[PDB]
Structure formats: C-alpha cells, structure tokens
C-alpha cells in the first residue's frame, strides 16, 4: 500500500527532478487508493507510475544505447531530461508540442546524421543497404525475432508495413522539409535513422523485446533516487541489467 | 553472449578470409544483441552465422566428397573459395550472378563429366542406368531413407517429383545450351550429374541427412581459424566427424 506522497517521489526521481503536472497527480492518487483497497498489487502500481515517464526519459536511454552503444550516465541524463543548464531539454518548453513519436525521431536524427556522437559509425554501417533490409535487421536487433513470435505478434506483417512505399515517401518529405539536408545521400541516410526511431517507439509502447525490458529496469533503479551502476562515462544496459 | 566482433571473425574464417558485406554485418549484429538480452542461446547464434556461409563453402565441401570421395584440404578450400591466385573463385566476380542452386549444378558438372577428377569413376558407375534409379539411389545415399521418414518428409512424393518428365526436359535443354557437349551419351551423363547436384542443394537447405550434418561440423571446426583434421591430400568427412 503506497501513500500518494510516495508515488510522486517515485515519479519525480524517474523524471530526474521534474515535479508532475496537476492532472497526473490525480492519476497517481488513484493508483495509491487502489492499493489501499487491494484492487491493485504493489508492483503493478509502481510500474504504471513509471510508464508515465516514457516520453521524457525512456527516449534518452533507448536512443543513446542504439547509436552510441551506451546509455547516458545519471549526470548526463539530468542534462538531457531536466536541468538548469540546458535551456531546452526534454521536459521543457521547446519540446512541449512534440508527441511521443516525434521525440524519438528527433533524438535519432540528432545522434545519427549530424555532428552527433554516432554519425561516423552509423554512416559506415548503413551505407549501401536498402530500406527493406534496414528495417528487417533493426526489427530483430530491438524487438527480437523469436521473442515477437512467441509474444504472438506476426513479424512478417509488421516489417512489410514499415517498409511499404507509402511510408518511405512520407518520411522523405518529412526529412526534406525539417532537416537542413539537400544532398541525395544524407537524406537517404536520415530516412533510415527515422525508421529505426519509429521502431524504438513501437518497442517501448508494447513492452516486448530486449531494449524495452532493460530500459524499464534502469528506470526502476533510477526511481529511488540513486543509480547503482552509475559509471562516469556511460552505463551499458545489457551488461548491467541481465 | 557474443560481441558482434566475434561473430564477424567466426564468419570470416568460415568464408576462408572473405570479410562479410555491409548488409550481413547488420544481420550478425542482431544475432549478437539477441544473446546479450537472452532472447537467443549461444550455440543458436553461432549456427545461424555459419548458415550464411552455405553458398560459398558448403558447395565446395559437399560436391567434392560426393564425386571424388574426399572433401578438399584447408589449403585446397582456400583455393576454391577465397584466394589471390584463383582469379575466379566462389566468393568472387564470376559467380556473383549464380544463385545457390546453380552453384551446386556448376560444381557437379565440372567434377563429373569433364576432364575433372571424378570423370573416369562417375562415368563407369552411372552408365546404362535410368533417370528414375539415378535419383532414387542418390536420394538414399545423401539424405538417407530411414532418416527422412522419421524426420517426417515423405520420400516417395519427393523422388517422384525429381524424376517427373517435365524436370528432365528442363535440364536437357539447360545442359545442351550451357555445356559444350553435342554427343548423345555425354548429355545423358551430364543430366544425371545435374540431378545429384539438385539433391545436394535440397539436402543442405533442410539440414536433414548424413551429408548435411557432417559438412556442418566441418564448417564449425573451420570457424575458429584452424582445421584439426587437415590431412594434406584431403579429409574424408565420415571418418573424421562421426
Ligand atoms: Ca534536476
Ligand atoms: Ca531547463
Ligand atoms: Ca538504486
Ligand atoms: Ca584467403
Ligand atoms: Ca580471388
Ligand atoms: Ca579447430
């Protein structure tokens, strides 16, 4: 049985010091009183609280891992998610009109195709490969192929959907309008980045797959105020949370 | 848990020093990260890596064994698969437009009907025997008859399929067009060679049978850089890997 004042601290630390909106406070309060009456277990209530921190936090953990091979340190996360120093950060004014999806896509393009940390590596790895293959291989890296089938979702139908011509056309226009790229190679390269972003979203929303399960456990550890692993130059998800 | 840099060395040695394409690197990378998250066992990941070396390598091991009675030595394999000296080799320019199937057929005709090593022996063994019998006996030699039935595949339906008149007609035209044979006996002889080739393909793609299981174990041994058996004048599969 959690007091509503415990669920707010659990939410605050997950959001790295951003105190929840008036609306969500009411949501948390419901989760509290549903545990006092035994209509909800303890672990269940805490999971739902941390599900609300998806857009703000999970966006920074997951993308950093996929592109740079390592999730950001606690100190680093602070900077990306909720800080005094970064004027524009994930839970700040700049981003208040981006949905969940467009947040993932934003982060991806930043890290991948720019002067971002992942540019040089991602540029060499995904050169001269087709849209179809980009999606198929990435799907398996993130969500697993065996895991998805056991979970009951049909892989083939999903991969086909992501790589259909209509989808690719939509992104091409999107990337051309938004990003300052004009070269034919860089646009091609950025579209792939946006696709992987779309997959990361699709993963974190369903809870299936290796990436999603590890990120969940990192946020759980981050909940109580202190991050146990907290290597100075980044925490590799798959090492730390088996 | 394999690092993606381990799976590439495992692939490279199997391909005898040919470094994988950009596309396949992405495939291997997925297999790595699926072992770090425990959505895939270790042995399973390594098998799938070596499954990718089928077209290049397994083609040289299996055909040599069937026609000359012995798989090529490590030094020999180098020459056939990936070398400086042989301008045209299996993982080189000449063969880049042949599918898996047409590779098997190519190797078979070479070794069997030409001035190839197997010509004299294969010529005496398969003279004055019908298409039906050629297929039936070969099926049993390669895939086993008991083994296939236990595996659940119905033998009778498969053998009939391979020896139907339509199939024979297709090959006759194929052999006439491609190979420099004009005599009525040599064409007949080459068609049989092409049939056995087709069976070798059908074997290595399903994983059933004695030939396929032994070739798999030879490639596994070849994976780590050094071939244990490595007799100078050839390795007999069935002796070395029981
Ligand atoms: Ca803070
Ligand atoms: Ca701020
Ligand atoms: Ca902790
Ligand atoms: Ca070599
Ligand atoms: Ca060569
Ligand atoms: Ca060895």
Indicate left, alpha or beta for B25 from its phi (over 0: left) and psi (-120 to 50: alpha).
alpha
How close A236 gets to chain B, by Cα (Å)? Answer: 11
Distance between start and end Cα atoms, chain B: 28
CB contact under 8 A, B27 and A141: no
Nearest residue to B43 via CA among B175, B227, B223, B229: B223
List CB contacts (< 8 A) between A141 and chain B.
Answer: 29-30, 33-34
- Whether residue B63 contacts residue B200, with contact meaning beta carbons closer than 8 Å, is answered with yes
CB contact under 8 A, B34 and A144: yes
Question: What distance in Å separates the CA atoms of residue A114 and residue A67, rounded to the nearest whole number?
Answer: 12
CA B215 / ligand 4 centre spacing (Å):
20
CA B8 / ligand 4 centre spacing (Å):
15
Question: What distance in Å separates the CA atoms of residue A115 and residue B66, rounded to the nearest whole number?
Answer: 56
Ligand 6 (ion): which residues have CB within 5 A?
Answer: B 221, 224, 226, 228
Torsion sign over Cα B95, B99, B100, B102: negative
3-state secondary structure at position B71: strand
- Whether residue B193 contacts residue B112, with contact meaning beta carbons closer than 8 Å, is answered with yes
CA geometry: angle A114, A205, A159, nearest 5 deg: 70
B22-36 helix and A131-143 helix, angle to the nearest 10 degrees: 10
CB contact under 8 A, B37 and A140: no
3-state secondary structure at position A71: strand
Tokens of A46: 């805490």
Tokens of A103: 């947040």
Sketch the domain layout of chain A as residue ranges: 1-242
Question: What distance in Å separates the CA atoms of residue A32 and residue A34, rounded to the nearest whole number?
Answer: 5
CA distances from A11 to A75, A98, A226 (A): 18, 21, 13
Question: What distance in Å separates the CA atoms of residue B228 and residue B231, rounded to the nearest whole number?
Answer: 9
Question: What distance in Å separates the CA atoms of residue A8 and residue B118, rounded to the nearest whole number?
Answer: 79
3-state secondary structure at position B30: helix
Instruction: State how far Cα B181 lies from the chain centre.
Output: 25
Resolution (Å) of this entry: 3.7
- Whether residue B55 contacts residue B65, with contact meaning beta carbons closer than 8 Å, is answered with no
Q: Which residue has the tokens 């069976």?
A: B199
* Least distant ligand from the CA of A19: 1
Burial of A147 (0-12, 13-18, 19+ CB in 10 A): buried
Chain B contacts to A (CB-CB under 8 A): 1, 22-23, 25-27, 29-30, 33-34, 36-40
Question: What distance in Å separates the CA atoms of residue B126 and residue B124, rounded to the nearest whole number?
Answer: 6
Tally of residues, chain A: 242
Experimental method: cryo-EM
Strands (E), chain A: none
Question: What distance in Å separates the CA atoms of residue A67 and residue A82, rounded to the nearest whole number?
Answer: 22
Question: What distance in Å separates the CA atoms of residue A82 and residue A70, rounded to the nearest whole number?
Answer: 20
CA A81 / ligand 2 centre spacing (Å):
8
Nearest residue to B80 via CA among B64, B69, B67, B66: B64
- Whether residue A197 contacts residue A104, with contact meaning beta carbons closer than 8 Å, is answered with yes
3-state secondary structure at position A78: helix
C-beta neighbour count of B92 within 10 angstroms: 15
| Alpha carbons within 13 A on the beta-carbon side of A97 | 2
């Amino acid at each position: 049985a959690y007091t509503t004042a415990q669920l707010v601290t659990a939410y605050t630390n997950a959001n790295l010091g951003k105190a929840p909106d008036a609306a969500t406070t009411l949501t948390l309060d419901a989760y509290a009183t549903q545990t006092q009456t035994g209509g909800l277990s303890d672990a269940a209530a805490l999971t739902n609280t941390l599900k609300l921190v998806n857009s703000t936090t999970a966006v920074a953990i997951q993308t950093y891992q996929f592109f740079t091979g390592v999730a950001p340190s606690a100190a680093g996360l602070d900077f990306l998610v909720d800080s005094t120093t970064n004027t524009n950060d994930l839970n700040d004014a700049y981003y208040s009109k981006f949905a969940q999806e467009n947040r993932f896509i934003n982060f991806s393009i930043n890290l991948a195709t720019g002067a971002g940390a992942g540019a040089t590596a991602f540029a060499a790895a995904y050169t001269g490969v087709s849209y179809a293959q980009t999606v198929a291989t990435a799907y398996d890296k993130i969500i697993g192929n065996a895991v998805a089938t056991a979970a009951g979702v049909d892989v083939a139908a999903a991969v086909a959907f992501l790589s259909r011509q209509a989808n690719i056309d939509y992104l091409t226009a999107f990337v051309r309008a938004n990003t300052p790229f004009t070269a034919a190679a860089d646009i091609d390269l950025a579209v792939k980045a946006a696709l992987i972003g779309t997959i990361l979203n699709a993963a974190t929303v369903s809870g299936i797959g290796g990436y999603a399960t590890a990120t969940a456990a990192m946020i759980n550890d981050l909940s109580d105020g202190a991050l146990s692993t907290d290597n100075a130059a980044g925490v590799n998800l798959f090492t730390a949370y088996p």
